[PDB]
Amino acid sequence: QTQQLHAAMADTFLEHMCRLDIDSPPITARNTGIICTIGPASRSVETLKEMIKSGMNVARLNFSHGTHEYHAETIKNVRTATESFASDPILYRPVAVALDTKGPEIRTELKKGATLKITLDNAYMEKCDENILWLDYKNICKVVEVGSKIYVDDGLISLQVKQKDFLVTEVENGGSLGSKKGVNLPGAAVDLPAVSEKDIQDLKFGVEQDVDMVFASFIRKASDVHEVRKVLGEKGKNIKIISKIENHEGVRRFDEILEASDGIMVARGDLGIEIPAEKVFLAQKMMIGRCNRAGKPVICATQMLESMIKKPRPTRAEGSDVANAVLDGADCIMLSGETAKGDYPLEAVRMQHLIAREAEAAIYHLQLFEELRRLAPITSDPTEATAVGAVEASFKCCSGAIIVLTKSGRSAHQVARYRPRAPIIAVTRNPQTARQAHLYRGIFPVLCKDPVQEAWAEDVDLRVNFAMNVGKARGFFKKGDVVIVLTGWRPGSGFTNTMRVVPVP
Amino acid sequence: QTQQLHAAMADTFLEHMCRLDIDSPPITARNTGIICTIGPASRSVETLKEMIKSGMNVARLNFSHGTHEYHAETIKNVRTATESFASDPILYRPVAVALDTKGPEIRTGLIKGSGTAEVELKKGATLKITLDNAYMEKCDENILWLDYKNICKVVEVGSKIYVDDGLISLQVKQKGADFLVTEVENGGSLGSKKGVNLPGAAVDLPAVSEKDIQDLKFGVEQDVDMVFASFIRKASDVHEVRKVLGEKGKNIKIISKIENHEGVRRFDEILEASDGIMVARGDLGIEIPAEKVFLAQKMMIGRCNRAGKPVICATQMLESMIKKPRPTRAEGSDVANAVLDGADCIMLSGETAKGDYPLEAVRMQHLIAREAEAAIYHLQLFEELRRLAPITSDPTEATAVGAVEASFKCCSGAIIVLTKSGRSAHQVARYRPRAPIIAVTRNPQTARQAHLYRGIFPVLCKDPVQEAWAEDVDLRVNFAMNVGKARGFFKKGDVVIVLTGWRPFTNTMRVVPVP
Amino acid sequence: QTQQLHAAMADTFLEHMCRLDIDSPPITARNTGIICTIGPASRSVETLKEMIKSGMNVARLNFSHGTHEYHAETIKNVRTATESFASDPILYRPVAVALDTKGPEIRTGLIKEVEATLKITLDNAYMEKCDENILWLDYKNICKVVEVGSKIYVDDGLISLQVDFLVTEVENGGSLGSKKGVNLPGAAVDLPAVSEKDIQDLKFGVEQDVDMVFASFIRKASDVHEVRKVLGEKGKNIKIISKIENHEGVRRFDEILEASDGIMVARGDLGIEIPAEKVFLAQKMMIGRCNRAGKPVICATQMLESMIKKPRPTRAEGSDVANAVLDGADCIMLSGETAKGDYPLEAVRMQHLIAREAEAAIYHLQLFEELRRLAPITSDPTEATAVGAVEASFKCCSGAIIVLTKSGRSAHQVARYRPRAPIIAVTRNPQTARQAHLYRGIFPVLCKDPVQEAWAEDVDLRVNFAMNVGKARGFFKKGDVVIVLTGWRPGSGFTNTMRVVPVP
Amino acid sequence: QTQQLHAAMADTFLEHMCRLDIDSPPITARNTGIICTIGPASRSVETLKEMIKSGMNVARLNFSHGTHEYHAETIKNVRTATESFASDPILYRPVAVALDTKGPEIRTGLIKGSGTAEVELKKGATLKITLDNAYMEKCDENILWLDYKNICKVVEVGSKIYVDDGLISLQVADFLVTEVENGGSLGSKKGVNLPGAAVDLPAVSEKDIQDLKFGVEQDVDMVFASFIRKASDVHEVRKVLGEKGKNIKIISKIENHEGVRRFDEILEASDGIMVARGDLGIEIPAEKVFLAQKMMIGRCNRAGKPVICATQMLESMIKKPRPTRAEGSDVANAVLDGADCIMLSGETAKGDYPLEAVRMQHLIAREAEAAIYHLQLFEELRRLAPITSDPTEATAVGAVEASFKCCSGAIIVLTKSGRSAHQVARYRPRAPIIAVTRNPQTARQAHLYRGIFPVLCKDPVQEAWAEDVDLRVNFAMNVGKARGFFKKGDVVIVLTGWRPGSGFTNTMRVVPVP
Secondary structure: OOOOHHHHOOOOHHHHHHHOOOOOOOOOOOOOEEEEEOOOOOOOHHHHHHHHHHOOOEEEEEOOOOOHHHHHHHHHHHHHHHHOOOOOOOOOOOOEEEEEOOOOOOEOOOOOOOEEEEEOOHHHOOOOOOOEEEOOOOOHHHHOOOOOEEEEOOOOEEEEEEEOOEEEEEEEEOOOOOOOOEEEOOOOOOOOOOOOHHHHHHHHHHHHOOOOEEEEOOOOOHHHHHHHHHHHOOOOOOOEEEEEEOOHHHHHOHHHHHHHOOEEEEEHHHHHHHOOHHHHHHHHHHHHHHHHHHOOOEEEEOOOOHHHHOOOOOOHHHHHHHHHHHHHOOOEEEEOHHHHOOOOHHHHHHHHHHHHHHHHHOOOHHHHHHHHHHOOOOOOOHHHHHHHHHHHHHHHOOOOOEEEEOOOOHHHHHHHOOOOOOOEEEEEOOHHHHHHHHHOOOEEEEEOOOOOOOOHHHHHHHHHHHHHHHHHHOOOOOOOOEEEEEEEOOOOOOOEEEEEEEEOO | OOOOHHHHOOOOHHHHHHHOOOOOOOOOOOOOEEEEEOOOOOOOHHHHHHHHHHOOOEEEEEOOOOOHHHHHHHHHHHHHHHHOOOOOOOOOOOOEEEEEOOOOOOEEOOEOOEOOOOEEEOOOOEEEEEOOOOOOOOEOOOEEEEOOOOHHHHOOOOOEEEEOOOOEEEEEEEEOOOEEEEEEEEOEEEOOOOEEEOOOOOOOOOOOOHHHHHHHHHHHHOOOOEEEEOOOOOHHHHHHHHHHHOOOOOOOEEEEEEOOHHHHHOHHHHHHHOOEEEEEHHHHHHHOOHHHHHHHHHHHHHHHHHHOOOEEEEOOOOHHHHOOOOOOHHHHHHHHHHHHHOOOEEEEOHHHHOOOOHHHHHHHHHHHHHHHHHOOOHHHHHHHHHHHOOOOOOHHHHHHHHHHHHHHHOOOOOEEEEOOOOHHHHHHHOOOOOOOEEEEEOOHHHHHHHHHOOOEEEEEOOOOOOOOHHHHHHHHHHHHHHHHHHOOOOOOOOEEEEEEOOOOOOOEEEEEEOO | OOOOHHHHOOOOHHHHHHOOOOOOOOOOOOOOEEEEEOOOOOOOHHHHHHHHHHOOOEEEEEOOOOOHHHHHHHHHHHHHHHHOOOOOOOOOOOOEEEEEOOOOOOEEOOEOOEOOEEEEEOOHHHOOOEOOOEEEEOOOOHHHHOOOOOEEEEOOOOEEEEOOEEEEEEEEOOOEOOOOEEEOOOOOOOOOOOOHHHHHHHHHHHHOOOOEEEEOOOOOHHHHHHHHHHHOOOOOOOEEEEEEOOHHHHHOHHHHHHHOOEEEEEHHHHHHHOOHHHHHHHHHHHHHHHHHHOOOEEEEOOOOHHHHOOOOOOHHHHHHHHHHHHHOOOEEEEOHHHHOOOOHHHHHHHHHHHHHHHHHOOOHHHHHHHHHHOOOOOOOHHHHHHHHHHHHHHHOOOOOEEEEOOOOHHHHHHHOOOOOOOEEEEEOOHHHHHHHHHOOOEEEEEOOOOOOOOHHHHHHHHHHHHHHHHHHHOOOOOOOEEEEEEEOOOOOOOEEEEEEEEOO | OOOOHHHHOOOOHHHHHHOOOOOOOOOOOOOOEEEEEOOOOOOOHHHHHHHHHHOOOEEEEEOOOOOHHHHHHHHHHHHHHHHOOOOOOOOOOOOEEEEEOOOOOOEEOOEOOEOOOOEEEOOOOEEEEEOOHHHOOOEOOOEEEEOOOOHHHHOOOOOEEEEOOOOEEEEOOOEEEEEEEEOEEEOOOOEEEOOOOOOOOOOOOHHHHHHHHHHHHOOOOEEEEOOOOOHHHHHHHHHHHOOOOOOOEEEEEEOOHHHHHOHHHHHHHOOEEEEEHHHHHHHOOHHHHHHHHHHHHHHHHHHOOOEEEEOOOOHHHHOOOOOOHHHHHHHHHHHHHOOOEEEEOHHHHOOOOHHHHHHHHHHHHHHHHHOOOHHHHHHHHHHHOOOOOOHHHHHHHHHHHHHHHOOOOOEEEEOOOOHHHHHHHOOOOOOOEEEEEOOHHHHHHHHHOOOEEEEEOOOOOOOOHHHHHHHHHHHHHHHHHHHOOOOOOOEEEEEEEOOOOOOOEEEEEEEEOO
């Protein structure tokens, strides 16, 4: 009757669909992380408080615009808002800070059929027109070929190369050209640096400001990830790198990118300029699938609730897009203009919360858990076996939660990859771990502030009890419900090995 | 290499997803019918011809607006445009006509005597709803007239009232005998004759009004192919529509529009009484919480697939294309997922009726649907449809499932089905073959209504019946071969499946090469 | 390259079959319990020691014949043989004692043998004057249970007839002897659940501390309850295995199973009572339902029959044993092969060898998947712990699942999910250690160490005992990973803790 | 309520097992071919007629024993019995003839000069093996002659020697001295096995050459080639059979370890396989035979080539009128494994109850065929199937799919060579496959395939080919009705082609029985 448990019991996916029930209410817990882009509409300490109450887990700062002093003040406000709830550790919600890079860029009426010359000659830097268009990408001729397409201004204008310091092009799709418009080269192996000079300064500032994760723009190959990793350096070795896949080469070389990264963003805006817009859903489902197979976080981004920039309710296509991203297996969903500049930032966050929670209940865990196991390698790793054991146990007794003690987050990540229905309450004393855990579907991170007990086994038990208080206080479960608890046999990371089925006290 | 065949071979759905390939191009054939609402943007014969070339299969006329004179003209234009292609029978594409009823709608009056005028409603402000027809054309930010005379009897203090696609929100503060005082929750621009929803309330308007009766009888006279019946709440609503159509309209398909909570609750009895369903997501997402609409959509599509009845996904699929030359990523996703869900048809409303980019909207649904169709995990879908399908003594059902199985085995260019009533082709469609189903019929209505079924590409044979039956079969089969080749569905040397009768009941399947 | 691991990884059952490899050697462990009927050929202390070394887990006493004095001595010899290994508790193997009842029977009278019409009489005048014209039976209600056309088999199905008197026509003739057993196919035989001899024998069973009763000719749930009632409070811990021997028992199987501790597929009599070509259907149905319920099932009768006379079995016999294991049978049985035959030890060794090969050839991927899907979602902690342990054991290919258990129940719960890894059930309860052999995969070990003062140390001591057994038996070695199940306090019913532990 | 259809619809194999119902009766048709070894007990025309009525589909002649005169007469009698039913083509059942070769056998000599004399060996005693032909007819308790001249080069000290179905066990210039490790009665000309030794006898001996020539002369349908070790053995037999025997099917018998190791290349080269478990279970440990059996049946099912399960399936019925429970189980499980045919050897050749043994195999096969889990079986066959543009394969799979959908009474297939019907059998339909042919050899050889009920149409060819096609289809209808496979009003599937000649099957119809 609740959380689509009738549908959960269907022996086929078709029958599962047939039983989905709008009058079967979901549980309180919402598993999918919500990433909110902060800007003029959401920047104030007072609005940030409401953003957190509405369900924001990660504050994204877009470094395509704004000064370091500007972003430093946004981060300060985020932390002011976040720590205003710190007095009660039971109810405190960690909030992560994400730095999203500008990344490499190419920058500059026009009738269809007309001929346009692209010039790299610096003489035309401030004198672009209907006949000659200057671009700042010096190696463009080396990466394009006759018949190559060139997009200008967020894909509005389309050119085709006819002759390859210059390129003779024919206007395929025409419109009003302007100053400093963005250029995309579909199918081209663009050889711009992994990080611009601006990016290097921005990433170092990210380390200064103690950010949790970096969303690295325009990642094309594993060596781009390694360059971002190198810039973050020893000091930033624990900041998660999320590679943004934005073009054809990124999609083609996705496997090597995933391996080198901590996670992925499906950057649908630019991806739908670089490849045909009708193919974007294929790229999204492929990347979410492969991330799910690897146990690495994946974010669905861009235009998910776009109309809510101007309207208090989303379109039906937007509601569908959010639900389907969750059903695809996205760990996180994202809001951009909707929260950064729109008239309804709080409504947009609340709607993502509501849809995600409904969608999580409609998941067909029977088949999903079955397939994840089948494709899960047999390894000698004790934590992996303990984690799969915990998820299986959680299904067998419909547990209220899986409670996991973790220093680095890894033990909770290993549970998350198996996609339990039960929320995963990850108890840590490491504040960064608490914040970074929002990247993983199902993890509800809690930061334990209690002193270390003198008997280590008592300290373990204290943290488990803290998780029990959190679940009760947040309405995930009640006294007498059964929960799964994951602990280790000695202190320090890498020793999670104990799964217990326990009553909520 | 093509049609996502690498993903097709995966032994798990997760691996199927992992194998989806942006460099694997789809086939030329598009299986999902595209329904276009016709209006000022898309009504001239000139533009209708381009609508057809762009992929329109069904012309939807919304009888919430317009006179019978006007709609008769629209229907004439659709037929003129459709028949302009008749002189090359190989390239002719049947086009269906659908009548969408007004039904039990609630509408506001005119802002200050104008059709275009608007007033700003400010959150927390007061707004009086009146039933007095003196204010019927004198609506403003203070007084709002609506045409539901009994609204007071079905609302209470605290009730919420939604106006203009649920974007303006009011709360009843005080009730009256012939009036309501409300407070604005969600403000915005209020225009003329906007739709009103009372989600809490049991609205007591007739399922089929006197106007609906007039429109349905006009539908019969005009030889429409189908009726989209608005606001269906229960089986008896459908029976009333069916009664008005009567014996003369008995072959017109009734598609029940599900757009309120009762329609969802009573879905099974509605589906049983109907020929098909529309998931009318606009009103549905106001009548129930917007976050639950995807559940109702997937439930209804699943139940229709299971029953073998056409289902249409409708409303705001490509909404931003009313004003913009391309869609948002959420809109792209929505179209693809509707197809992956199992929708037989997808629909465009304002995008084609009134927007700046009607042809572009049609082309985009065409491009997305074709990509989505290739990305279907047929291995599991076909297995489940066969499993959930009763094993019966019906020879035509057995031939149909055999033909679909055969099409998978040789990855055929098509399943060609010779059919008078369309039934044989519908029976093939319900098993969801990858191969396009070329349904060859001499019956014009059969050809038009076939568009309701995923995969059916209807072709109308106009040649006389041959004396020799084998030669008449071969004439129709070769007709399908020539359409398929012309449309690029397949080439000489490819293998196709052909379904016919054996003697002058479809029960013969042949595996034949394309000449 | 070992344990059919290549076939284990196949995505389909067909590919699994195709990868089965006679050159892929099995692990040391053999999961399927071997039940041996004891008799003249295997009754001595010295032969019993070799029977244990050859793989006997349960000694079966057939009470159809033999005195209490006789069976008392057999039991004494079993115990002497079993306890001769008790000095080393790391290598000691528990051996269970099973009492198989004579049960309710229909018998003919004394002749005057005799080689067409034939009248059945209940008239005690014909009691010692049986012949070709008149045959007396001791089942007074036979006329209430049969009808015109109903078949009647005499002497282990050898003779066949078609029907306070009955007039019958001989369908299949033969030599009709004295005091022969009679079967009534399809008939609802209303003989008591427990005969007068059974009552005395079951009392004897309780006095002799037997581990389990194989109750003959169980037709309905109430028959089980009557056996349970006769065993009483003194015998409350004695397991009752219902023998399904006829059509009614098959029809009413679900109710019998619910009331029983386990099931024996008694194929000999079953194949007289129903057409012999249908027995495999009944076997597979009963094994399936028992697996679904997680209750032990034994496959019985003629599994290695030719080995009564010969030192190697027929190919059909090799096949039958393997297929019983592949079907899901917890135990396999030997009757005449070990009781009276010329090659008792060879017969035990052959069941061991075949069982071990067959267990490796199980398609655990699908088996476990199906057991999970059909696994009821309940609030029970021990059930959730058990399935979590089995899932973990597959994920890390563990050397074993170690289970501390007082009653055996915790280990039974693991066994029903059919892990590949051996289940080392460590107990201090000697009877639990003996009874655990009824369950596939359970390797029971009897810990004899004193209860340590600190319970947590006592728990660790027993886990370490299991580690030592596994090392000595070659199940695993230092550094391997095993699964360990324990509870949150002393006493039964509190198993709730699964650990992945390195072997020290 | 019949044919285990309730168990058929189970969503899991476990639930499928749970639903198996002893009160759910099978259909009339029995799909698994029954091969009967003919000998003194079953050789007469009289008995052979009853063997046919009881279900014999193939008569096997074992050329390990008997002269050509003897076998020629057996063959003559098989044909006399078979053709006694030819007057009504509707009821005529084709019977195939199989020649089973001696191959590279090792046999002992005569006990005290007689073929039926025996000496009871005692466990523990000593026994000398000699190659000196002086003793080839004077074997006894103390000296034993063997016919494997080159025996001494291929075995060493401590080697194990097995005699008479591995039942007697022994441990080691032209002799060997041994101690009886397992004793018992020692008879004449018993088979000897050297499991740990590389026996070097020819694939095709002079005797085998003579026998194969005889097989061609006698128009046998198939050869069962003994002790095939590798693909080159199969090619040798194929080449000896040559052009005159080109249409004789070669079934390779797997009876040793090398045969199992090299099974894939053997299968590729053969028309089918026999799992010859008798010797197989001596050459490799007896406990591993089920693994070898299931592997071979699986791989044959995968490749679409006939597989036969052989030896001791109902062994006790040589002396008893009823089989043991292990025997009943073995037959059922061979069918559930996927074996196309099951075999009787001593049970029919020399035993006291040949007809009872044939009847019992018939009863068990039919029960087991209903108990198959077609849902998974068919799904896996479709998935494992190599995907092709072949129209004949598409028509075959569509026909099988259709047969399940309407629980058809039969699949009727017109075929000249048998191939079209073989293509249907490959996908393992529940419905029987009535294969209508005018080719008598096709009719006989079709018995190698699970499900094929071959019928021999003897009507003249009609001028109008379409009417010739409809003629044979209606013959099939008449056969099915007469055999009680279906009645008027039932739905059946019918496969035909678009033109005459082999390779054009492309038409599937779902038709009611007239």
